[PDB]
Design brief:
The structure is a homodimer.
Chain A lengths: L1 E5 L1 E2 L8 E7 L2 E10 L8 E6 L11 E9 L2 E10 L2 E5 L10 E9 L2
Protein name (chains A, B): Putative baseplate protein
């Protein structure tokens, strides 16, 4: 069991907001709130952060939805969860620039 | 490979919006667009849809993010994925009422 802990943030990623994970009863939980991210060009994916060594490598893999946010407007994002950490894809027609991202996800460990 | 197929919606779930899943190369994709759901209390779970028997037994389990929506306002929803279908959770400290949900997710089978 591991308490709420900061993910190691990828280069280009801002230091403000919350990006944490925890393991309770064998399920990894991840949450991201108002994480500033670099520019995400259309159909590009950029890294957001990586799981400290303490979490191990037996982590689940799946894709889910999140949001991009700036200036009152929310946009749909693609969140990649894997052992490699969290990354964010832009499924929209225009680049996503000066945005923050938010999501929450969880799944059993492997 | 299963083409885009409508899920069967659980009781209380509205008829508008779109809720469907597909399997391409051992990976299931599920999306919801403006699906009207029942009032959900904080930390409680409301059933949304079930997979037709074509999709089989070997479906993954994880919780991801989606959105709640009413009256021009979006909030964080939780999306529950399992063999049992799609269900929606409320990570907010107030009840989510009169909401439609949108989400997208995917993972490999097994």
């Amino acid at each position: 069991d591991i308490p709420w802990t900061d993910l190691n943030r990828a280069s280009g990623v801002g230091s403000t907001g919350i990006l944490q994970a925890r393991i309770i009863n064998g399920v990894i939980y991840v949450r991201g709130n108002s994480i500033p991210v670099p520019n995400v060009a259309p159909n590009f994916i950029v890294p957001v952060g990586t799981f400290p060594p303490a979490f191990g490598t037996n982590l689940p893999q799946f894709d889910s939805s999140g949001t991009f946010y700036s200036h009152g407007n929310l946009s749909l994002s693609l969140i990649n969860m894997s052992p490699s950490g969290i990354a964010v894809g832009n499924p929209n027609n225009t680049s996503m620039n000066g945005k923050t991202i938010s999501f929450a996800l969880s799944a059993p460990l492997l």
